[PDB]
């Protein structure tokens, strides 16, 4: 009578896994995206006699840090980081966040933004002089040349804050930015200092890293697992009916 | 002490 | 199911081999590019039932677990030379590498022979990285000559004798396959290809220098197309394998 | 009891659970066997219920012996 | 996600830039004191897969 | 009732057999790959009367030793062997393994490896002077020239240990390398002597020998065999319900 | 939870939305039309 609940848990968590996979597939064109991993954990129920009931719980263990494919766009402000490297932005709630989106934009007032989040430099958020032409070097250095002026007068303005962090040290926040895990925060500090060993390419944008093969295989597996759980539910549903209706 | 019957109390609850 | 899990490993591996092929094809116009070749290995074979005690067939069941790429390797096979009348371009004849200095301060190694004099002399790469062992060119230079043995001589006005500048030393490794490709036409010493041996060109195995020539890409073109055809067909075969297991489970689950 | 069939191995070297060789252990559950076990167990359950019902009816009729 | 497309796109872009440079060099044969341009193409960053 | 345990078996093993074929398809580009063969064996249950139930189990009777693909890479280290010929490497567990992979890689030390396992010569593992151009002759002889030195100083350093073994004499180990079977070890000894008649071609690499037609046909047969097993299972399940209802009243 | 094993935790996304489409302000090429009324701009400037 309670195997129906085990099968129902399996089917519901299969639905959750399918939702995760569909959300990953919907962002196949999102610039600088990290796919969410999915794994079904097994929770064994601990009673006294025979733990013959073990349930299923869907989980998302971090994300995927494999870089995607770089689109070469003839623009100086689109940048791509090294493998396992992160650009730093000031988060929505006045905090710090890390990202791979190298689509740096400028405003009328001259401040650099990523998705609307101001970028964080050595001295705080980076502000470029109003209406200047901007070039980004291979180590984060930013040069600004005023329009209609000799290129000789170009001068550096600041340096981007580029950090290095692996998947174990990084957890996705609800606003799409990545942050440090508590266990990584305890060791590497609240704020990560700039890592000078990371090279950055200017003029190339990093796309998403969702793998179509894994997504399609996961969808097929989810469908089949759901059908099996429905069969288990149906088998349990007939037996209980007969039993009660007759042994009364 | 009873509780919510069915789906809510038969799905793996959060730790705390 | 084991079938879906493996066939997924197969499909992913053929996508890697196509990514490698695409990278090789995109670098046809790169100077001093060594072609990449992907090698795969089968994973651990699972033994469920041991072979029986032996005219008849043996009795075992050792199903494998898939495939995995081991290490994409570059063929340091020497490329061809293209003539560019620029006096700053030098090409290597043999196995050797130019040493350059990364902004972090660690040394990288490159084979692209395109160099330029920057605003404070100094022969730098096209990306601006300085090219150890430092070569300063004076402003009075009328012609720059890079010799066979790496001697950089500079001619000036009112001086019948050419004023030299320095020696271009090449770095020689013992396993050129083993360097880590940083990306931006730079290789670094990995645990393999260690002990970078500096040497003046012409001796201790270092190659000669040709001034005015650039080594072209090594990539052969027909091999890439044949590999692409085979990758596509293997991908289709693995897709047909995935199709079979799915239908089988659809009939089992619709019991 | 835990079945003694060898655990399946998947090559995911980035997985934290991967060992020194990079193989993650996945369960050895046979889908066809479990489906057939469910079906056969259901049939045995129904047969036993029918047996119990027949036996209960027989004692109910035994309760009216001689009358 | 597809990948091999975003690599072949860079290949096409490099060849397009080379063809543009060649067309500029050919168009300016009659200019007095013109200097030929050569575009240097050179690859992007490599991704490194863990090897347990 | 127990008929369900017959067809279900063929439903399970069909998956296992498929897990073999799919694996062969996953290594279509693996250098020096010997495809695993699959075969179903009918095991009868003998008991007390009307011998009537005969289960099926899926086994792998060795591997396929038909030579693999032959591409020409202008590399002096890529070597291919003649048919029924094997290269000798030192396995992970200090043992002796045989392979067809000819993708020899020279380590910085100068020690030769194939897939990380050092290759074996007559003096054991083969070592080479550091950073020297290597050319392998047509009989396994290895010549090393230090770059810059004149070609007159080309000197041989060693010889590859090439062995001859048929597909029935060799068994695939769990690390992917082949070893002598028990029968073959009974008459040929634990260590295989070098065969001097084996000819080795340098500058070409041997690919896999997976046949696509065989794999596709096998997959189609597997799918259309499972469906039948699922039909028989459904028939038996439907049959048992009535029989169970017979127990009423 | 409080932490070997894999970091447990179900975190589910929502989808994808388009935020803003941006135009690439890069200098285009010039074509010769002998009409004297046509002018091309070499740089970042707009006719009002």
């Amino acid at each position: 009578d309670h195997a129906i609940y085990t099968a129902m848990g399996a089917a519901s968590q299969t639905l959750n896994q399918q939702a995760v996979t569909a959300s990953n597939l919907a962002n196949a064109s999102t610039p600088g995206f990290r796919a969410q991993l999915n794994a079904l954990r097994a929770v064994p129920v601990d009673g006294l006699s025979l733990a013959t009931r073990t349930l299923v719980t869907a989980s998302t263990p971090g994300a995927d840090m494999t870089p995607g494919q770089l689109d070469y766009t003839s623009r100086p402000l689109d940048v791509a980081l090294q493998q396992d490297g992160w650009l730093v932005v000031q988060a929505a709630d006045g905090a710090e966040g890390y990202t791979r989106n190298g689509n740096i934009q400028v405003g009328p007032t001259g401040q650099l933004t990523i998705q609307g989040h101001p970028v964080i430099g050595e001295g705080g958020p980076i502000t470029v002089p109003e209406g200047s032409e901007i070039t980004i070097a291979a180590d984060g250095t930013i040069s600004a040349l005023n329009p209609g002026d000799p290129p000789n007068t170009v001068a550096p303005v600041g340096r981007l804050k580029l950090v290095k962090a692996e998947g174990n040290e990084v957890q996705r926040s609800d606003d799409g930015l990545f942050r440090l895990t508590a266990e990584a925060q305890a060791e590497r500090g609240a704020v990560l200092a700039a890592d000078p060993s990371i090279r950055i390419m200017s003029g190339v944008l990093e796309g998403s890293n969702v793998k179509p093969v894994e997504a399609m295989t996961d969808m097929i597996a989810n469908a089949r697992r759901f059908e099996m759980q429905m069969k288990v539910i149906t088998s349990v549903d007939e037996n209980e009916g007969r039993a009660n209706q007759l042994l009364s | 002490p009873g509780g919510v019957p069915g789906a809510l109390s038969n799905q793996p609850a959060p730790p705390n | 199911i084991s079938s879906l899990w493996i066939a997924k490993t197969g499909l992913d591996a053929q996508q890697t081999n196509m990514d490698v092929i695409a990278n090789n094809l995109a670098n046809v116009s790169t100077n001093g590019f060594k072609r990449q070749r992907a090698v795969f290995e089968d994973l651990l074979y699972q033994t469920i039932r041991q072979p029986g005690a032996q005219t008849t067939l043996p009795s075992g069941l050792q199903i494998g677990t898939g495939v995995r790429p081991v290490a994409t390797e570059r063929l340091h096979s020497q490329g061809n030379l293209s003539q560019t009348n620029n006096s700053k371009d030098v090409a290597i004849k043999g196995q050797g590498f130019f040493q350059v200095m990364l902004p972090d301060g660690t040394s990288a190694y490159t084979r692209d022979g395109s160099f330029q004099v920057d605003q404070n002399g100094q022969l730098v790469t096209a990306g601006g990285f300085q090219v150890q062992p430092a070569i300063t060119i004076p402003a009075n230079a009328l012609s720059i000559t890079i010799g066979r043995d790496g001697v950089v001589s500079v001619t000036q006005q009112g001086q019948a004798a050419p004023v030299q500048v320095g020696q271009l030393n090449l770095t020689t490794f013992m396993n050129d396959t083993g360097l880590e490709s940083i990306g931006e036409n730079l290789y670094i010493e990995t645990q393999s290809s260690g002990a970078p041996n500096e040497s003046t060109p012409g001796l201790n195995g270092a190659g000669l220098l040709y001034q005015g020539y650039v080594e072209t890409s090594n990539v052969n073109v027909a091999e890439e197309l044949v590999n692409m055809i085979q990758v596509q067909r293997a991908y289709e075969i693995n897709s047909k394998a995935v199709s079979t297991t799915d239908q089988m489970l659809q009939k089992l689950t619709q019991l | 009891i835990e079945s003694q069939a060898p655990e399946k191995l998947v090559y995911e070297p980035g997985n934290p659970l991967a060992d020194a060789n990079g193989y993650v252990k996945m369960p050895n559950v046979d889908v066809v066997g479990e489906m057939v076990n469910t079906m056969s167990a259901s049939r045995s359950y129904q047969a036993n219920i029918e047996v119990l019902n027949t036996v209960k009816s027989m004692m109910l009729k035994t309760l009216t012996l001689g009358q | 996600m597809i990948s091999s497309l975003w690599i072949a796109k860079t290949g096409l872009d490099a060849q397009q830039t080379n063809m543009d440079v060649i067309a500029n060099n050919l168009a300016n044969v009659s200019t007095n004191g013109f200097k030929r341009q050569r575009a240097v193409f050179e690859d992007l960053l490599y991704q490194t897969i863990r090897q347990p």
Side-chain angles (χ1 to χ4, degrees), chain A, chain B, chain C, chain D, chain E:
Chain A
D1 202 5
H2 276 46
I4 190 187
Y5 295 114
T6 300
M8 175 256 286
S12 45
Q13 302 310 315
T14 297
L15 255 297
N16 278 339
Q17 217 185 323
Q18 165 91 61
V20 165
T21 297
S23 185
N24 277 339
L25 273 187
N27 289 313
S29 271
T30 285
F33 188 64
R34 317 283 98 179
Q36 267 248 297
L37 300 172
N38 33 30
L40 290 179
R41 306 172 99 268
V43 300
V45 181
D46 303 353
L48 59 83
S49 191
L50 308 179
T52 61
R53 286 203 208 112
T54 282
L55 317 160
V56 162
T57 312
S59 67
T60 63
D64 179 355
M65 310 288 158
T66 320
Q69 307 303 300
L70 299 190
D71 320 304
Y72 174 70
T73 313
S74 310
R75 212 179 80 114
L77 286 169
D78 312 278
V79 308
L81 291 323
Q82 207 158 33
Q83 193 189 10
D84 286 294
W86 299 85
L87 261 158
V88 184
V89 308
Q90 155 172 29
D93 57 14
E96 191 186 60
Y98 314 82
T99 179
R100 303 305 291 276
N101 191 8
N103 188 11
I104 308 177
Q105 303 267 336
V106 315
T109 171
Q111 43 182 98
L112 298 171
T113 89
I114 287 184
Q115 316 142 359
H117 302 299
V119 184
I120 282 186
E122 37 100 63
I126 283 154
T127 290
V128 153
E130 271 166 0
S132 322
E133 166 198 3
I134 318 159
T135 303
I136 308 205
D139 72 348
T141 313
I142 293 166
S143 307
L145 177 69
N146 211 58
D149 277 302
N152 177 22
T153 82
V154 81
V157 172
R159 266 192 52 158
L160 297 166
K161 213 163 84 152
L162 312 162
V163 306
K164 185 203 211 63
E166 291 156 20
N168 326 123
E169 293 155 350
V170 160
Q171 174 217 347
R172 180 177 319 185
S173 167
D174 274 347
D175 51 7
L177 302 164
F178 288 91
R179 274 181 171 90
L180 287 168
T181 57
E183 71 206 20
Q185 226 156 311
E187 302 314 318
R188 287 184 62 182
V191 51
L192 304 187
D195 214 326
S197 46
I198 290 190
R199 292 153 40 73
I200 177 175
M201 297 213 76
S202 63
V204 295
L205 215 79
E206 153 139 23
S208 37
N209 70 329
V210 297
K211 304 172 191 33
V213 176
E214 189 172 357
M216 281 265 268
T217 285
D218 283 347
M219 290 147 126
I220 292 174
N222 295 342
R224 304 309 174 245
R225 172 149 30 76
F226 188 84
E227 321 315 339
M228 309 199 300
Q229 309 306 333
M230 297 311 301
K231 155 63 91 183
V232 177
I233 291 182
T234 279
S235 283
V236 163
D237 161 11
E238 180 176 59
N239 294 358
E240 181 62 58
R242 308 171 65 65
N244 75 67
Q245 177 173 235
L246 272 323
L247 290 194
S248 66
Chain B
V4 165
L8 199 64
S9 74
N10 273 6
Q11 263 184 60
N16 35 282
Chain C
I1 181 175
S2 67
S3 174
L4 281 197
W5 233 118
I6 298 180
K8 159 184 177 181
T9 55
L11 287 168
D12 291 358
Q14 305 289 351
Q15 208 106 190
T16 271
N17 199 0
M18 163 70 82
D19 294 357
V20 162
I21 296 166
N23 181 32
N24 285 347
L25 287 181
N27 274 47
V28 54
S29 51
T30 325
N31 294 296
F33 178 68
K34 298 303 141 187
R35 66 171 310 240
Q36 283 242 305
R37 186 178 110 185
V39 289
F40 304 108
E41 212 177 41
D42 36 18
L43 303 178
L44 181 76
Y45 288 101
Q46 266 303 288
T47 303
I48 301 147
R49 151 179 77 259
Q50 324 272 1
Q54 182 253 298
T55 75
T56 177
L57 294 164
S59 161
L61 185 52
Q62 198 184 4
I63 329 167
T65 47
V67 67
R68 153 202 54 126
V70 175
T72 88
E73 47 179 9
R74 74 200 39 268
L75 291 63
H76 272 294
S77 176
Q78 212 269 301
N80 318 300
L81 305 177
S82 48
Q83 192 205 140
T84 38
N85 281 287
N86 214 7
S87 64
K88 330 252 193 214
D89 307 337
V90 310
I92 309 179
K93 166 207 183 171
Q95 53 84 30
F97 296 102
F98 294 111
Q99 180 179 6
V100 314
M101 192 247 275
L102 279 175
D104 188 19
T106 72
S107 40
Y109 306 97
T110 186
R111 204 151 151 100
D112 189 3
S114 161
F115 298 114
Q116 309 183 39
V117 189
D118 72 276
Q119 97 269 13
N120 293 300
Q122 169 95 237
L123 260 207
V124 299
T125 37
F129 309 127
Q130 299 182 4
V131 178
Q132 267 26 60
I135 296 295
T136 304
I137 294 305
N140 312 345
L142 296 172
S143 314
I144 320 188
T145 298
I146 292 78
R148 274 178 81 268
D149 284 4
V151 180
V152 178
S153 44
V154 158
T155 199
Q156 298 149 357
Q157 295 221 1
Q159 213 63 62
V163 165
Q164 283 67 59
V165 158
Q167 190 90 285
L168 274 159
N169 296 324
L170 293 174
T171 280
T172 301
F173 293 103
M174 291 293 194
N175 181 238
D176 292 342
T177 311
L179 301 103
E180 171 176 354
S181 313
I182 288 284
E184 172 29 29
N185 257 341
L186 296 172
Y187 312 111
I188 58 173
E189 155 196 358
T190 52
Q191 301 196 301
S192 54
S193 71
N197 199 237
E198 274 186 354
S199 273
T200 183
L203 70 84
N204 293 2
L208 303 187
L209 300 176
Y210 279 97
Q211 191 217 5
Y213 292 100
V214 201
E215 180 174 355
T216 79
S217 147
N218 164 329
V219 174
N220 185 347
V221 185
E223 194 166 357
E224 307 291 342
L225 293 203
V226 178
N227 269 338
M228 253 164 38
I229 284 174
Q230 171 154 346
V231 163
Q232 182 184 349
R233 303 302 175 222
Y235 191 85
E236 288 180 355
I237 279 274
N238 289 336
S239 278
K240 184 59 184 61
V242 164
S243 269
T244 284
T245 293
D246 149 64
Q247 296 175 359
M248 263 173 199
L249 295 184
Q250 195 168 1
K251 185 76 173 189
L252 151 76
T253 58
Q254 78 181 2
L255 224 54
Chain D
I1 52 170
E2 321 296 309
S3 34
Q4 307 285 353
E7 315 266 337
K8 315 267 180 84
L9 292 189
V10 201
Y11 187 63
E12 283 192 359
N15 216 4
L17 315 107
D19 39 2
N21 274 335
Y23 294 130
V24 187
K25 306 192 253 172
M26 299 264 297
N28 41 356
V29 192
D30 194 6
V31 283
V32 190
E34 296 305 323
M35 292 215 88
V36 171
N37 276 356
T38 284
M39 283 171 27
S40 74
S42 171
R43 290 321 196 174
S44 290
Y45 190 74
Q46 300 167 2
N48 297 15
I49 286 165
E50 292 296 90
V51 160
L52 192 51
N53 258 346
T54 295
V55 166
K56 142 195 108 171
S57 163
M58 260 164 33
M59 12 213 327
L60 214 65
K61 284 173 31 53
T62 302
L63 282 173
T64 85
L65 216 171
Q67 151 215 301
Chain E
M1 42 141 340
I2 300 172
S3 160
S4 312
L5 272 191
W6 292 136
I7 297 172
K9 155 189 170 182
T10 72
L12 298 174
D13 287 1
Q15 305 296 346
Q16 282 283 355
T17 293
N18 204 4
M19 174 86 243
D20 297 6
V21 168
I22 294 168
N24 185 333
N25 282 344
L26 283 183
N28 277 289
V29 278
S30 49
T31 39
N32 293 299
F34 175 68
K35 302 297 182 181
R36 61 181 287 294
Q37 288 211 104
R38 194 181 71 91
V40 179
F41 313 99
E42 145 196 80
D43 60 18
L44 301 160
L45 311 93
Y46 283 70
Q47 88 181 71
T48 301
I49 289 187
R50 310 286 289 181
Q51 248 203 300

